[PDB]
């Protein structure tokens, strides 16, 4: 006699094969659990014949009539002989049917979206000061530089004759112009210090306060920028089951007629009863029909789906915006289900252990979970500055040198218009001074 | 019979259970005291019928026609048999109903809004050094600039001939005037450097040790400056029960016909007698009718609510702009009331002591009073420094420059003064040096 | 009939009075619980007559004969009528005797020593670099300054004639001496920058690498010193009962025949059974005879004594090196014990509540706990630098100016010996140059 | 009868209970499997007599005279009735004894010492910027120093007459040679400033924007430099089961006559077949006789022990120089053994599933495998920067100065070369300029 194996569509355990042809018999199925059953058939030497569950459930106790549904009901009534499927091992299922040893180890955990790690774009260094403070500094170095020009002309001690060798009447100069006064202002702001130093006490206090002002601006900048380069990583506000029980902001449920909600239904510990106190209220709202709708409502809404760890291993290697929030709630396993008192309990108990010692149950999991490449993590650690987060200081350096050379032709043309008043003609005296600049020597 | 339990709906003690289908009976209710009365029924063994109180108070000895009401009249006239609810042990109640022995530790306290806005701290940058340190660096900079001037007018290697062509005779003169030695002292302190640079090793060592001094003071200042650039929110204008007594800006009150109205009514503390002389006058406006009208008038008005401690522990855990002000005024407990001597006081008295030995009173405490963690004040995550944070460096920049325009005129009037004994009293050297500003092109 | 009150020496509840006289009757007793009983006698109008417990225990079940000891055994046998004492309220005591309502609220917690907050002594700023690295920097600025002198004499381009006006033959100088080369070395180390700049490319690379070296020394100094000024507070490695159960490094016990170990003996929760799994093994080693030996063995050895919160309130306000490690394990209370079925249960139940509403039970606790002044905490928060933790940079500044002025008389005497070879006599030509230095003017 | 339970003493599963008085019987034992067998006896209902195994192994199918031993022969010959102990489900055992269904999830892994010493990181200071950034600041400093030279040989305001007395005619000359413009570029980058200061606004803007560039690059460098000055301990030379296969420096082994010796014995993985070809040869030295001789030979020798996962979880939690290397080789479970078909397998199979539903298997897991927290690697608390931390700035200081002595000779041979066409080939301008070093007092 050929056996009749019950099973159910779940990805990647059992799923239909992609082929055009009129698929006949066991042909249309592919996945982990049939490729398990391809190998159990070679060992035990029988003939399986795949035939799905009818009511589309896994198995649960309806507790009105106290009866079962799903693949569990397919076994108790002896309709189908095996249950090669992700049928988990629980306390209430073991009393009515006979499982084998596990071929996979589970854990209930939360499938939730990864939050977006919004990149600190290339103008990230302006962040440690507020955008009105950068203006207040700029109006200061436009202000204080203008105040210093007022005082330096007004103060009769900044008037010094430069002339280190015996003036003998009068060559007295006042080296602070406008263009010198901003350069003292900018030069002290950028901590470099100019070549021009105030001499009168009327201008020392302007030099003294502006040095103290740019001492605090730069020091408050550097102390704050330690915080902004050490970017505090995304910490989406669920990190455990203790967290997820206490906010009704995020919807969280399970699959209906499944071993996930059956866990919370029968549990008596405080956190997990609190989740079932939540889920029993909106029992039609949160409890989705299958795991596939458990996935999709996390993809769209603010939903945190409770499910098994081995299917999260297939989801998060496919969708690189979903993750396993939290740790394993419990531990379970996938048994090849058999009816109560079967001779195939012990022969599969052997033939799972035989496949496990020679690595066949790990060669199949690596094949059908197929990690595919996915961004693992930022790997939270010291965070050496790339081009992506300094970046814009080269942009202002590139734009600053572009803005510079037009002042250089501005200095050229204002000179070439000035000297050509009396000396030579307008266009040619520009080219005359080009002969001066292209000279490779020191000259007049 | 059924042991009729009189209870009164107050969160998080006894509240209605929400669901899809309406429930009927004892399962309508949930909370702390429902979970407690289940534990008393498990240990002792009895049926219990929740019979929520008609006249909606807890209990209060009324005046001249004195008759108890609320849950206390349910106990005196034997309409109830128990009172598992927040019926707090007070003096006047335990004379007439006969309480069991407490199951949770409360006390009268003050509920009030958290202050939103910040203490500005318009300077806030002086903070990383103590004001002992800030005055000592001036007495160092006043100190070093004097001892540098003493050495530089004593060291016979600072006396230098500038005279760059070929030094003949009768030239040498220090560049360290006493005005100049502060400018090395302040100039090195502010990290910007001076035009003065010492020669003459005895003056080098002063310049050497003042540099290493100001290397550490600036480096220690930038270390703590990350910490002290955090705003502090405003300190609430009340911090105790005495603070509400010495004001009428904040109306303060309690639940009418409860233990807290009764406590201030029969108090002989000078603080608390004034706090009832307030409440008795405007009784129609500062005695609310429930706990729920307490919190809603703290939020949607200026108000400070005198309520119990453990009910604050639920509210402030839940609502994050809302905190406890001060410490416990008195200490009292919640006790399961019984009538005037019953065969169920002593049974529950042992039964309450059993639960806190097992820890189940603490387990039920955590189960209801814990909630969302109310994300703390130490959750900074970002601080762009603004006009509130640094602030006062713009004030002292406005302070020093107005000081500088004052001393600029004072020097202008001084060179008017030494040129006065040459020509005239004021207007000679005024106008000729007021020309000096108005020239801006010609030197002398 | 006058009552016979049993009680027991515990501090500060009941203790002998300090007086020389032959103390007669109730005279010799003073403390909290007799001053409680002084006020209960005024209310209820009886005559107490203090008489101690005989066997010196509080009360516990010997569980061999199943009998009691202590004050509990004094009550059951009706020897003494009251039990006005710190006799706690537990489950096993309530079944045999009758307590009143509490007059005080307890909690079991851990009395352990405060660790010493070792002060960061005034040379604290040298800490961010290792003491061999400070030598390696000092041998660098002694090394690199010496290398620069070698190269500058060797390089034929540092030989420049200063002389800004038409040399016409030869005045070519080499301004880098020894004393100039160290000053470039020190001057770049202290970030200030000298007035002397290298000119030949042979000396630019020495100037270039030494600038990059002191860029990293100072930056690694400032980045590390943020950690050392933010002194990570003392965190003595017990912070809870979950911590204290899992190290056998610290002895922890209780008092024998007391309600502290009776809690752990009967508990079934995992952490507190683990402590009783520890304490049952060395039951004679850790379990002290009284609370006073519970105090003293913490004072001397590495012992963490489990005791009641209200006695920790008297200990830690006296001994300012002990503290309450952890939070309250449970909650209990002090009942005035009465025998099983007494008429004085309810009259004291009244007269404790009457004393509590009018604040008498808080006026007595404030008197007999008498906080006395004790250092509360460092109050862990931002830690503004006092003189105690910068400190020594003023010491090296004071010592640097002391070391300077002896170089100034060293520069004076080396000059005064040199010029007196040909010009004048040895001692007088010093005083001649004193006339030069004391001159208030510029001169030759 | 008594249901004789064969068990074998292994921590933290079944260990002797320590006390003062010696205990007798089932109370001699404690640990995980004693707490488990109590739970199986509570649920199912049976007496149990611990009868610790005589021949001290767990179980191993011996060769040609093949007879099981240890706990397995206790089950086959019905000397036991159960085997509640770490008797792990393998293929060859479950054929002959008949296991229950697992209660804890293990797998073979590698125990090995943590590497003590640090990866030195002799430079370690380049780390706060990515090597993309480090090369770009040179291409900026090579870039800006070129474009500053282009403008300064083109701007007709940089051409200045030094000539300080009174400028006549035919003088003006730039101070920006192409050698000089790098010295402004490097000089501003290293925060120290140059003797060069630009005039002529077009050159000011280059100096303006290069200053703000190097203000940010230095400030961003000092921000992350606190993070990257932490040592990393050495990466262990093994990180997997494959790494022990490709070496003979570390002897590696397992418990003789256990599941782990049996697993490599009958493995057909190319990695694991080599790992038994190793162990079989020196079987007398790399197959220890217990778990306890495993850990003691990892510590007191160079050795890497192939043992189970859950027993590593106790040891590495306890001993802090000792860690798990790699991941789980296989996956298997601990099962309560029974004989060849018993009326107690299925009773315990449901009984184990009941306990993990309630969570008591996790409660007993936490109760024994948790211990002292093994104070983590992220417990820095202090880092005085030493010769290991910064280090490489002394290397590049030794690198640049040896480079500088090379270029100093190269310039010395260059002024020998231009003076060669004056007088002689080498020794003329060599010796006369070798005099120039040897003079040190005379100028020219
Ligand atoms: N597949 C599980 C139910 C769904 C789940 O727990 O994720 C079972 O059949 O038991
Ligand atoms: N809990 C109080 C009532 C509320 C209040 O007075 O603040 C009582 O037991 O009477
Ligand atoms: N004084 C306590 C016992 C000692 C203690 O718990 O600290 C009692 O009598 O119950
Ligand atoms: N736990 C192993 C024994 C120890 C080992 O082989 O590493 C077993 O069940 O056989």
Numbering used by the authors:
A (entry chain C), B (entry chain D), C (entry chain A), D (entry chain B): 431 to 874
Give sentences from the paper.
Each KAR subunit has a multi-domain organization, including the amino-terminal domain (ATD), involved in receptor assembly and trafficking, the ligand-binding domain (LBD) that binds agonists, competitive antagonists and positive allosteric modulators (PAMs), the transmembrane domain (TMD), which forms an ion-conducting channel, and the carboxy-terminal domain, which determines surface expression, synaptic localization and interactions with intracellular proteins. Here we present cryo-electron microscopy structures of the kainate receptor GluK2 in the presence of the agonist glutamate and the positive allosteric modulators lectin concanavalin A and BPAM344.
We improved the resolution of this region by averaging the focused signal across all configurations and further refer to this LBD–TMD structure as GluK2Glu–ConA–BPAM. Compared with the agonist-unbound open-clamshell LBDs in the closed-state structure of GluK2BPAM, the individual LBDs in GluK2Glu–ConA–BPAM show Glu molecules bound, with each clamshell closed via a 20° rotation of the lower lobe D2 towards the upper lobe D1. In the context of back-to-back LBD dimers that maintain their two-fold rotational symmetry and intact D1–D1 interfaces in both GluK2BPAM and GluK2Glu–ConA–BPAM, the 20° closures of individual LBDs lead to a marked separation of the D2 lobes, exemplified by an increase in the distance between Cα atoms of S670 from 20 Å in GluK2BPAM to 30 Å in GluK2Glu–ConA–BPAM. In the context of the dimer-of-dimers arrangement, the separation of the D2 lobes results in LBD tetramer expansion. We measured the channel pore radius in GluK2Glu–ConA–BPAM and observed that the gate region became much wider than in the previously published GluK2BPAM structure. Indeed, during equilibrium molecular dynamics simulations of GluK2Glu–ConA–BPAM incorporated into a lipid bilayer and surrounded by aqueous electrolyte solution, the channel pore remained continuously hydrated, and monovalent cations freely permeated through the gate region in both directions in the absence of applied voltage. In response to Glu binding, the separation of D2 lobes in LBD dimers leads to LBD layer expansion, characterized by the substantial increase in the distance between D2 lobes of diagonal B and D subunit LBDs.
